[PDB]
Amino acid sequence: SWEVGCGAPVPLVTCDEQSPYRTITGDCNNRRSPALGAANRALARWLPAEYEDGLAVPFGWTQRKTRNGFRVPLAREVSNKIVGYLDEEGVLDQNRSLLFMQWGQIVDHDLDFAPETELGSSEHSKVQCEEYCVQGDECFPIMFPKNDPKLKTQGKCMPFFRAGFVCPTPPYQSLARDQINAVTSFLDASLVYGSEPSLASRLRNLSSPLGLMAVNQEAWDHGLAYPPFNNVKPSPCEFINTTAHVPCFQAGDSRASEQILLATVHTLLLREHNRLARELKRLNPHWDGEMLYQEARKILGAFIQIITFRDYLPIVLGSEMQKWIPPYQGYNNSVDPRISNVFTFAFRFGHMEVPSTVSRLDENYQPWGPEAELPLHTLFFNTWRIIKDGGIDPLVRGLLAKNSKLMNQNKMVTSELRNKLFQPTHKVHGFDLAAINLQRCRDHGMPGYNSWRGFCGLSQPKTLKGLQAVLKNKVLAKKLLDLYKTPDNIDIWIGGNAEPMVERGRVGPLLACLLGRQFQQIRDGDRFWWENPGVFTEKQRDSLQKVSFSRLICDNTHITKVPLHAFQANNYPHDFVDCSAVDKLDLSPWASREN
C-alpha cells in the first residue's frame, strides 16, 4: 500500500483513443489504465517477492543466512549435478522440428526482457566483478564449486549482473525489488519494430514514402534483404571473427543476433514487412508512407498471434491447452495483460529444447558443403556465417528438416549452452545458461517451487516420497533434495522443468499452468487482438486464417520445397511439397476506394 505511481519510463505518450493502430511503446491499449502492458515498467507479481532481507538482497548473497533453515546451493553445482550430460545420442524430439524451439525464442523475445544493470560510462566495477569475483552492489557472481573443471581454466567465478529494477533505476528503498520489462507485454511484433519510439524510427526507411523498413546496403542475399548492421563498437559479432569484420544485425530486439538461427527468423520477418508494404502500395497507390508502415505492421502482428495460438501453443501445452486457454469470447479490459516475473522463467523451458548442432542443407536437403554441421557454441553472435557462408536459405532448410532436443530428466541442457555459452560483454565461450537461470531466479526474488505448486492448485511435496511421486523419478528427486534439502527451496526454473511432460505437450503440470495463465491474459487483455471485432474486417480475418510459417518461407526465401505443418518432425522428400500447394495470404480486402 505504498508508492503505486512509481517508475521511470517514457515521460510523454498521450492517447489518440480513436487510432486503429498500436503504439510502439504499448501504451493506450487499455483505455482506463493507459500504462498497462507498456514497456519499461515493472514486471507483474503473481506472488509476493522473496528476498533474503525481504527487499532487494537475493538468496545466496550472504554465507551465514539461510532460506527456511537451509543454505541455498550454488547455481553452478545444481547445474553440474542435475542439468548436465555428455551423451548427445538419442536426445532429439521425434515429432518436433527445430522451428518448434525457434518460434519459442521469437515469442519470448516479443513478450519479456529484463535488462542487466552493468551501466556506468566507463567503470571500475565491471573489472571488480570479473577479475576478482567480488560480490557487491550489482555484481552477483556465480561461484564455482569444489572440483569444477572451470577452476583450472576460467578462474573462481562467472561474472553475473543483477537486472534493472523500477523507480530509481540507480539505487534502492521500500517495497520489494521489481524488475523491469523493456518490451511490450502484447504479442505485437515488438521484436521487428522496437519498443521505443526512438529505435522504431531508426529501423524504418523514411527516405521514401513507401512504408518500408531499412535494409542492409553493404550485403545482399541473392537479391533478398538483410537487417542493417548495428555499428556500435565494440561488437560481439565482430569479436568472434576479427578477420571477417561482420557486425551484429540491427532489429527491434537487442538480442536478435544471439544465435545464427534467431537472426535467420528476424530476417524472414523483416523481409515479410517490406513484401506486405510493396503489395499494399500496388493495391492502394494513394496511401502515404505512414499508413503503409502501420497497415503492414498490423498484419505481421496478427501473423505472429495466429501462428502462436493456432500452431505452436497447442503442441506445447497439449492436453492442458483447453483447460487454461479456452475459445475466444472477446476483449476483457479487466484482465491484466502484463507479463509476470515468473513467466520469464517459466518460458525458459525452451533452453532444454536446444540441440548441440546446427545444420545447413542444400536445395536437395542434403548437407551443404564440407562444414555443413556446426557446433552451437561456434554460432553465438555469429553473423559472418550467414553473410559470408551461403545466406539464410541453407539455415531455413535446416529448421524444417532437423529435430529439436527433447527434454529428458537425465539429459536437460546441452554443454554447448551449459559450459560454452558466449555473452556479448565478455570474451570467453565459457558461461553456463543453466547456472545463469538459477542465479537469475534468486536475483528476481522468486518464491520456491512449492509456492508456485500451491498457486497452480497442485500438491506441495514435503518429503522424498512425495517428490518421487510428482517427478516420477527416484534419482532426480533424491538428487534435488540432496542439494535443496527441502522441496520448498527448489528454484522455480529447475522445479518446473523436472516434472514429467503432460500428454501431447512439452511442459509439465506446473509450467502448463504458469504458461497457460499468461498467454490467456495477454490474449484476453489485448484490445488489438486479431479476432476482436473492429480490429480487422470480416474479409480480412478470412484471409489471415490461411497464413502459415511455410508460406513465410515461400514468399521470402528461394526455398521451393516446404512442409504443410512446419512445427512437427518432417522428412525429405515425402513430407515436403512445392510452395504452390501452400495457401497464399490474400491482401484483396485491404484495398480501399475513395467514393
Ligand X SMILES: *[C@@H]1O[C@H](CO)[C@@H](O[C@@H]2O[C@H](CO)[C@@H](O[C@@H]3O[C@H](CO)[C@@H](O)[C@H](O)[C@@H]3O)[C@H](O)[C@H]2NC(C)=O)[C@H](O)[C@H]1NC(C)=O
Ligand Y SMILES: *[C@@H]1O[C@H](CO)[C@@H](O[C@@H]2O[C@H](CO)[C@@H](O)[C@H](O)[C@H]2NC(C)=O)[C@H](O)[C@H]1NC(C)=O
Ligand Z SMILES: *[C@@H]1O[C@H](CO)[C@@H](O)[C@H](O)[C@H]1NC(C)=O
| Count, residues near ligand Y per rule CB under 6 A | 10
> CA nearest 396: which of 569, 586, 260?
260
Is 190 flagged in the annotation as binding? yes
> CA nearest 294: which of 305, 309, 280?
280
Task: Spell out where 152-230 has E strands.
Answer: 157-158, 180-181
Is 186 flagged in the annotation as binding? yes
Q: How far is the CB of 518 from Ca ion (least distance, A)?
A: 13
Among 81, 278, 388, 527, binds ligand Y (CB under 6 A): 388
CA 308, chain centre distance (Å): 13
Residues 413-442 that bind ligand Y (CB under 6 A): none
Respond yes or no: is residue 109 known to be catalytic.
Answer: yes
CA 383, chain centre distance (Å): 19
Question: How far, CA to CA in Å, does 8 sit from each of 73, 119, 162?
Answer: 35, 16, 18
Taking CB positions, which residue lies at the least distance from ligand HEM?
104
Note whether 315 binds ligand Z by CB under 6 A: no
Note whether 589 binds ligand Y by CB under 6 A: no
Find the angle CA(573)-CA(577)-CA(579) to the nearest 5 degrees. Answer: 140
Note whether 215 binds ligand X by CB under 6 A: yes
Note whether 390 binds ligand Y by CB under 6 A: no
Among 155, 314, 424, 589, binds ligand Y (CB under 6 A): 314
Q: How far is the CB of 375 from ligand Y (least distance, A)?
A: 12
200-206-210-211 Cα dihedral, nearest 10 degrees: 10
Is 117 flagged in the annotation as binding? no
CA distance 372 to 374: 6
Q: How far is the CB of 242 from ligand HEM (least distance, A)?
A: 21
Is 558 flagged in the annotation as binding? no
Find the angle CA(107)-CA(455)-CA(84) to the nearest 5 degrees. Answer: 60
> CA nearest 461: which of 509, 502, 517?
509
Q: If you write DSSP's letter for every residue of 376-401 in order, what string do you get?
A: GGGGBT--HHHHTTT-SHHHHHHHHH
Q: How far is the CB of 2 from ligand X (least distance, A)?
A: 48
Is 253 flagged in the annotation as binding? no
CA distance 591 to 581: 25
Q: Which does 384 bind (CB under 5 to 8 A by kind): Ca ion, ligand X, ligand Y, none?
A: ligand Y
Is 184 flagged in the annotation as binding? yes
Question: How far, CA to CA in Å, does 170 sit from each of 2, 161, 164, 264, 341?
Answer: 20, 14, 8, 36, 20
Note whether 207 binds ligand X by CB under 6 A: yes
Active-site hit among 109, 266, 377, 444: 109
- Are the CB atoms for 430 and 153 separated by under 8 Å? yes
Q: Which does 113 bind (CB under 5 to 8 A by kind): Ca ion, ligand HEM, ligand Z, none?
A: ligand HEM
Q: Which does 440 bind (CB under 5 to 8 A by kind): ligand HEM, ligand Y, Ca ion, none?
A: ligand HEM
- Are the CB atoms for 583 and 551 separated by under 8 Å? yes
Among 128, 284, 294, 568, binds ligand Y (CB under 6 A): 568
Is 526 flagged in the annotation as binding? no
> CA nearest 42: which of 74, 82, 5?
5
Note whether 384 binds ligand Y by CB under 6 A: yes
Q: How far is the CB of 110 from ligand X (least distance, A)?
A: 23
> CA nearest 502: which of 322, 356, 341?
322
Cell of 360: 545447413
List the x/- string, 323-352, binding to ligand Z by CB under 6 A. Answer: ---------x-xx-----------------
Note whether 231 binds ligand X by CB under 6 A: no
Residue 208 vs 588, nearer CB to ligand X: 208
CA 313, chain centre distance (Å): 14
| Amino acid occupying residue 196 | E
Find the angle CA(159)-CA(165)-CA(171) to the nearest 5 degrees. Answer: 85
**304: helix, strand or coil:** helix
Of the candidate spans 52-60, 210-218, 313-321, 517-525, the one that interacts with ligand X by CB under 6 A turns out to be: 210-218
Among 95, 117, 154, 205, binds ligand X (CB under 6 A): 205
Find the angle CA(162)-CA(164)-CA(168) to the nearest 5 degrees. Answer: 125
Is 351 flagged in the annotation as binding? yes
Q: Which does 112 bind (CB under 5 to 8 A by kind): ligand Z, ligand HEM, Ca ion, none?
A: ligand HEM
Taking CB positions, which residue lies at the least distance from ligand Z?
332
Q: Which does 205 bind (CB under 5 to 8 A by kind): ligand Z, ligand Y, ligand X, none?
A: ligand X
Residue 28 vs 480, nearer CB to Ca ion: 28
Q: How far is the CB of 333 from ligand Z (least distance, A)?
A: 8
Residues, the chain: 595
Q: Which residue has the cell 504479442?
A: 187
Residue 53 vs 583, nearer CB to ligand Y: 583
Residue ranges for the binding site for heme b? 108, 258, 351
Which spans of this chain sit near ligand Z (rule: CB under 6 A)? 332, 334-335
- Residues catalogued as catalytic: 109
Query: What are the residues binding ligand X (CB under 6 A)?
Result: 205, 207-208, 210, 212, 214-215
- Residues contributing to the annotated binding site for Ca(2+): 110, 184, 186, 188, 190
